[PDB]
């Protein structure tokens, strides 16, 4: 593996993520804490009612941050199927070009739930192009580092789309998207790219793993949220294995983790939480927890983020530094030893303890 261009690693604290966005500009505080993180995310919906869009509002935090910190690594999300509003040349392009959103058979446009959010229709070549050079364009800039393609399960979860545009077509976006995967691993060798692609599927018989070649890493969400009538417990075994996998393969992991309990969801897919909402003794004790699971799973390049929601502006956490993230880890000892639903894990100045069937860990700080 070449690593050349991934972000900065250390194991003396905890490694961290940071997954955002704003309305608004950051304020400077605020770019000092993001400079702060060794891997950044840049959300959708960047900015937008400042800088006008969100590719504008990408580019000015992007710039910012790197002039307090030039070795953060800064990514930009791109959704690969889904339209969401605030991109100015996407509103451009698809007020173009209405063919450019998935329809059924009748000709009308399929959608998100609750909603009027539509869908690139990929298989369109001059769609995939459209999509390609935009993620392209805007890591070609000086202060983005690569890309974070998010939707990949709802493009590899047969269901997904079958069922809005039957099984056809949903096989031809398939082939479409390993198309496009594989120009950006190509167009993007130099640069970092993250999918959101581990998560506990029945569909998927190594949980993602089978598509992380395209890849430099993976982001993970759901991680906790269980579907297809498995335990919480049982769901979070089968994720940690996975994840276990990958870190030792060598691929960055970027594990999000919702500090507020999932919002009652049984698709598998996504990972909407309610706002947190703990005293200051529970929430040490859902952060000991988090920490405890990622820590079962961490390797070299493995990065966590603990957050009530990716919108700093609704956060409890924004700017906020736990005790548990200034204290000294050190280096693994050796991998995580399994005891049905129990955990343990040494580290140089930590020894972590966590039990899935009753919800808790312990943190033994050296």
Known sequence: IDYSNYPEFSWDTMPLYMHV???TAYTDEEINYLASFPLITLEKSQAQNTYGSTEEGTLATASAI????????????????????NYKNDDEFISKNPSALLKNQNNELVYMPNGSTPFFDITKS???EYWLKSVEDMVATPNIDGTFIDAN??????????????????????????????????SLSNNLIL?????????????????????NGSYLEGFDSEAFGMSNAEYLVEGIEATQKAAQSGKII????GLGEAIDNNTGIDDQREDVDLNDEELNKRVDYLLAIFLICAEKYSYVYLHDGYL???????????????????????KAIKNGYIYTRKFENLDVWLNLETQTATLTWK
Not at 165 to 174: D, H, L, S, T
Not at 195 to 215: D, K, M, S, T
Not at 254 to 257: A, E, V
Not at 316 to 334: R, S, T
């Open 21 to 23: 966005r704003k309305n």
């Open 66 to 85: 790197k002039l307090k910190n030039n070795k953060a690594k800064v990514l930009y999300y791109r959704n690969v199927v889904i339209n969401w509003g």
């Open 126 to 128: 001059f769609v995939q």
């Open 153 to 186: 399960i709802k493009v590899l979860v047969p269901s997904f789309f079958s069922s809005k545009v039957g099984v056809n077509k949903q096989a031809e976006i398939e082939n479409s998207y390993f198309s496009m995967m594989s120009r950006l691993k190509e």
């Open 195 to 215: 999918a959101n692609i581990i998560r506990v599927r029945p569909e998927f018989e190594e949980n993602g793993l089978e598509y992380l070649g395209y890849f």
């Open 254 to 257: 970027t594990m999000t983790l």
């Open 312 to 334: 700093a502006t609704n956060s409890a956490v924004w700017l906020h530094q736990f005790d548990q993230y200034k204290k000294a880890l050190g280096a693994p000892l050796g």
